[PDB]
Structure 1
Amino acid sequence: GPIRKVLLLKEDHEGLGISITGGKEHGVPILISEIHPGQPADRCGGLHVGDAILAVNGVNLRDTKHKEAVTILSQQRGEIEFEVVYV
């Protein structure tokens, strides 16, 4: 589908509210496999199970290993911009 840019608002006591799978070492993108009900990703409205996360706050995640992506994603705070695509 089309590449989309999606804004998420996270409070400091929260995680993102997603499960991710994938990673470069597995030959697949960082993929959203779950969205937790009521947590920030659900609340933002624009993220869906099956979305690939291409970038977060301008950091490319297309070529990142799984644990690299975890570190990068978990570092982001507050108003967080995602670039995503549903294939």
Structure 2
Amino acid sequence: PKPGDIFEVELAKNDNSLGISVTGGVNTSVRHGGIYVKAVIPQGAAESDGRIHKGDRVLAVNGVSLEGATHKQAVETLRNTGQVVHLLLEKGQSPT
């Protein structure tokens, strides 16, 4: 994919464990910045389904908007997902 394209991620729930975590980035000291990844959990989806690394930014989650205030609360939203989880991430601009 190109640097900017907003590719969507649609996979299936494995062992009721998405294998992905989030952190507080759009609620540190900005009106509306963005969220980041805490750590990749290659033990379910991030491993098999792949297409989930560290650094990318999560725009939304199963319809739930993260931009605004979703550091720990989002962790529950991702867990409370059916069999088909729809994630919308964006190719970060600094893979470090």
TM range (shorter): 0.7 to 0.9
User: 2:26 — aligned with what?
Assistant: 24
Structure whose alpha-carbon radius of gyration is higher: 2
CA RMSD of aligned residues (A): 1.9
List alignment gaps of at least 5 residues for structure 1.
none
Aligned length: 86
Query: 2:84 corresponds to which letter in structure 1?
Result: E
% of aligned pairs identical? Answer: 36
- AA in 2 matched with 1:77: G
Alignment of 1:42-61 (within 5 A): 42-61=47-66
Secondary structure of the 1:73 match is helix
SS of equivalent to 1:84: strand
Unaligned runs of 5+ residues in structure 2 are none
Q: Which of residues 73, 81, 85 in structure 2 aligns to 1:80?
A: 85
Report the TM-score when normalising by structure 1. Answer: 0.77
SS of the equivalent of 1:81 reads strand
Greater share of helix residues, 1 or 2?
Answer: 1
Could you tell me how far apart the structure 1 residues matched to 2:12 and 2:80 are? 14
Is 1:4 the counterpart of 2:15 in the alignment?
no
